[PDB]
Design a protein around this ligand. Sequence first.
Ligand SMILES: COc1cc(O)c2c(=O)cc(-c3ccc(O)c(O)c3)oc2c1
Ligand SMILES: COc1cc(O)c2c(=O)cc(-c3ccc(O)c(O)c3)oc2c1
Ligand code: NA
Ligand code: NA
Lengths: 116, 115, 115, 116
Amino acid sequence: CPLMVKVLDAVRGSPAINVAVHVFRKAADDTWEPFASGKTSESGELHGLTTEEEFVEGIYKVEIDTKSYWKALGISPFHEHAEVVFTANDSGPRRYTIAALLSPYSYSTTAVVTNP
Amino acid sequence: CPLMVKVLDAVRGSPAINVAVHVFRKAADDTWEPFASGKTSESGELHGLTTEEEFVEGIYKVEIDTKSYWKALGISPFHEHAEVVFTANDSGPRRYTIAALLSPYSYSTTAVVTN
Amino acid sequence: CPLMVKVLDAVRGSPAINVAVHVFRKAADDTWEPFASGKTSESGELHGLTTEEEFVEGIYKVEIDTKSYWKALGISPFHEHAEVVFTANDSGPRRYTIAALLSPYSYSTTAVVTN
Amino acid sequence: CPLMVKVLDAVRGSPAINVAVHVFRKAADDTWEPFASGKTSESGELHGLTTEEEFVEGIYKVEIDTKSYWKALGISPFHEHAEVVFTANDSGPRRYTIAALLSPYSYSTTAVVTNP
Ligand SMILES: COc1cc(O)c2c(=O)cc(-c3ccc(O)c(O)c3)oc2c1
Ligand SMILES: COc1cc(O)c2c(=O)cc(-c3ccc(O)c(O)c3)oc2c1
Ligand code: NA
Ligand code: NA
């Protein structure tokens, strides 16, 4: 898979398990079209969102459902979600790992991009 | 003003100057309505976006134009922009500072909410 | 003052108040010599640590007592402290702000160096 | 191995390769004794620093040689190194991953702690 999402919990020092993730792709009319979705596993990772064939050039938005995550742990957090927006595959196919590190009032996100 | 945005550059160890910032309010039909905008100052800060009277409870989005910032420095970045989406809540402290720390392939954002 | 320390709490979205901070200078024999210290204020800031005359070039270490901060809030943390080690350089801009953003199992630190 | 170090480069969007790491353990006299060292691989990971038997309770310091890393890439960075200091194994053996995300004037570090 050319798109993977990894989420960590900075309060617990653990993977962030059962985090919902929705991916969108900007359409020709400039709307955000639903592209793929899933949830993180016990390891904090979400694999299998898409395929090399389907993951064409485009502008993609990875929404990480942080508020839904934190509230289930009894924490009222600040953000609604984390949104990671990027152009993909503009120089040919790449593999993308989107990582996020979550706290109730803060998050950081990183991308690791590799050429297969 | 109840909303301030502060932007820092983790590559040069400096405020991120002249960065465009757009704030939107979520409307009843779920679209994003322009609310306020500006450019960060020489200190990386953008003050005066709104007033107590206008900044009612609701969902807001702060978009920070990170891509143009990095391109003006000759650096190829990953993200189109950084987006910070949150609910304004009258029960909490009254002053919101949205801080962002920028790198070409990463950013971190924080909310400092005080009285 | 050429050196300021700012500490933020990523769990509560607030300044980190009453955090002990110790600054050390590296001596010729490689040991760490106490240099300045204090506690962060209600704004999470510690001003007045040193002066231009005393803050000569060299290697400095800023230790932030994060463990005591989290324990006073009833939260079990990972780190003993956060340590920031850097060289002061007269060629660069003259004012150093060392910022730290704290979580129980993580921290991030940044240097904002300006004139 | 119960101690692993992972390092990422926030400028390049890549693993941070060939980063030197020195681990110390506080001795009874309160000095920092050299405990293990190594360097990150092509994946940004450093495995095999220690063993379950040798990684006893203690206060450990993981020094990540960030300045040496960045200068080789033609970047004069701010910090000398990142130092991650923590008590380990105080409630019995655990597995620790120390992760760091590096920029020239900033870094963030996280721990993921698991119970085997
Ligand atoms: C199990 O421990 C791991 C494993 C990873 O793959 C990762 C990873 O891929 C990325 C990061 C990370 C660390 C600090 C940040 O501020 C950030 O945005 C990301 O942590 C990990 C920790
Ligand atoms: C001038 O120095 C300052 C001043 C500030 O108010 C701030 C501030 O409000 C927040 C942060 C900050 C630091 C690290 C992060 O990972 C992050 O997301 C934010 O840095 C500052 C630095
Ligand atoms: Na192209
Ligand atoms: Na014990």
